[PDB]
């Protein structure tokens, strides 16, 4: 048994809710919150900008030191950094950004990172401002992630569409 509330069960291991991931993280303090990162860990907008703002920019300060030491992530890759005030850990995962012209086939690789963590609170990768089809992202999530994932979808109309269309 865990602390996540009001999620709709989609599969054995995937659950979904219409919620602000920042507000969910603040309430649950999960072991792992997933950030929808870019390869430079520049947390400017969307879930990344919203998570970073909720940490008072501490996420960005930590990320800048990570990049200075290790260089950029790969598209499809990830790193584990602090969750600051939101979670124990933040798993920064880079899904492909269609609006930068990145290969959508890398979405499955991005979701595979979730399998290294038993439970996660996460964004629907490559959806929203990342430019991919969110129905497709949810399908790739359910077909790739085997650990327990609690998906927080910010946009209400997007949530209703994802639930109604889920196979
Ligand atoms: C995958 O990252 C994002 C996903 C979404 C979709 C949503 O939850 O409404 C919005 C903004 C984002 O930055």
Curated annotation (Swiss-Prot):
Subcellular localization(s) per the UniProt record: Host endoplasmic reticulum membrane
Tree of life domain: Viruses
Coiled-coil boundaries: none
Protein activity control: Inhibited in vitro by GRL-0617.
Protein name in the entry: Papain-like protease nsp3
Subunit structure: May form homohexamers. Interacts with N protein.
Effect of residue 31 to A: In strain: Mu/B.1.621
Reaction catalysed by this enzyme: Thiol-dependent hydrolysis of ester, thioester, amide, peptide and isopeptide bonds formed by the C-terminal Gly of ubiquitin (a 76-residue protein attached to proteins as an intracellular targeting signal)
Annotated function: Responsible for the cleavages located at the N-terminus of the replicase polyprotein. Participates together with nsp4 in the assembly of virally-induced cytoplasmic double-membrane vesicles necessary for viral replication. Antagonizes innate immune induction of type I interferon by blocking the phosphorylation, dimerization and subsequent nuclear translocation of host IRF3. Also prevents host NF-kappa-B signaling. In addition, PL-PRO possesses a deubiquitinating/deISGylating activity and processes both 'Lys-48'- and 'Lys-63'-linked polyubiquitin chains from cellular substrates.
Domain Macro span(s) in chain numbering: 1-167
Topology of the protein relative to the lipid bilayer: Multi-pass membrane protein
